[PDB]
Each structure stands twice: as C-alpha cells, then as structure tokens.
Design a protein around this ligand. Structure first.
Ligand code: JW2
Length: 164
C-alpha cells in the first residue's frame, strides 16, 4: 500500500504533536518516493530539524527548505529539482499535501499542507497526499502564521519518518 509518514512538530521548542500523512504513490510514485525518503533521511539528508518557514492563516502551512531554511532552497533525492509528475490529484480542501515550486518542473523538497480548498493551484502544484491524523497540529501551526507568511513562533519538524 501507500506509504504513511509522520512529522513531529514543535512550536518554540515545545511539542505540538504529530502530523501523519498518506503519500499517494499509486498516483504520483516519484513525488511520493521523494517525500518518503526525505522523511526517513535514508539518503543522508531530509526534513529532520527543518522548519515551517511560511504559514498563512486560512491558506496553508509551508515547509521543506532544509538547505537554506528560508524558502529559497531544498533538494530532491534525484538531484536539485525534478519534473511535475502529473496534476491528477486536486487541491480539494484542508489537509491536502502538495509540492511548492518556482514554476513548472521545479519540485525539490518544499511542500505545503492546505488549510482550505485551493483550487487555483490545480494544474500548477503537484498534489501527492493528505493528512490522515493531526489536523489539530496543522491548525496550531496555521494559528502561528500571518498574512505575510511570517511565523510568530519557531515551527520545527523535530522528528520525521515512515510508519508503513
Ligand atoms: O513558495 C513557493 N515557491 C517559492 C519557491 C519554492 C521552492 C524553491 C524556490 N522558490 C510556493 O510554491 N508556495 C506554495 C505554497 C502556497 C502557494 C504555493
């Protein structure tokens, strides 16, 4: 079956809890594999210790820049960037997991979890999973965002990995 991965998140050094995500490897195997390996850190790099650097209430929580920690960086397990696999899955509502990018075919490691339906991102951002458990954790993260995306608390992925 599809991988189940986790993110344990702190806000200002205190645990918020765990976000569990299903990666739709059946639809986007290459995008799901990249995220799965960055969670385990099995390639010698990944999300562990990185932050949610851009959070916009009533929109989304963005993370994954483990190289520059500011939204300009990140890298995939394949190389610096990889193509848009497909746009089959849509940004249907809260809990959608999707790839951040800098235009077509620029997927790296940055991703976002939506807190609303974001239909304008369909056909532009590759959706590759959804929140199974921990939407309460996502709402907490979201509450520490702002209109500019600047976070009011330091949001850190302390631990991450694969459940199944
Ligand atoms: O912030 C985003 N892209 C900039 C970027 C991403 C990687 C490398 C360099 N520059 C980006 O796609 N955010 C998504 C979250 C909601 C709007 C779309």
């Amino acid at each position: 079956g599809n991988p189940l991965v986790y993110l344990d998140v702190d806000a200002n050094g205190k645990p918020l809890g765990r976000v569990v995500l299903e990666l739709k490897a059946d639809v986007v195997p290459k995008t799901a594999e990249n995220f799965r390996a960055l969670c385990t850190g099995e390639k010698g790099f990944g999300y562990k210790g990185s932050t949610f650097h851009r959070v916009i209430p009533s929109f989304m929580c963005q993370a994954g820049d483990f190289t520059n920690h500011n939204g300009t960086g990140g890298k995939s397990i394949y190389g610096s960037r990889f193509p848009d696999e497909n746009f089959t899955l849509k940004h249907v509502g809260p809990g959608v997991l999707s790839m951040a990018n800098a235009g077509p075919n620029t997927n790296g490691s940055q991703f976002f979890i939506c807190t609303i339906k974001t239909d304008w991102l369909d056909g532009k951002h590759v959706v590759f999973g959804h929140v199974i458990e921990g939407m309460d954790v996502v709402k907490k993260i979201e509450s520490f965002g702002s209109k500019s995306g600047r976070t009011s608390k330091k949001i850190v992925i302390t631990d991450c990995g694969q459940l199944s």
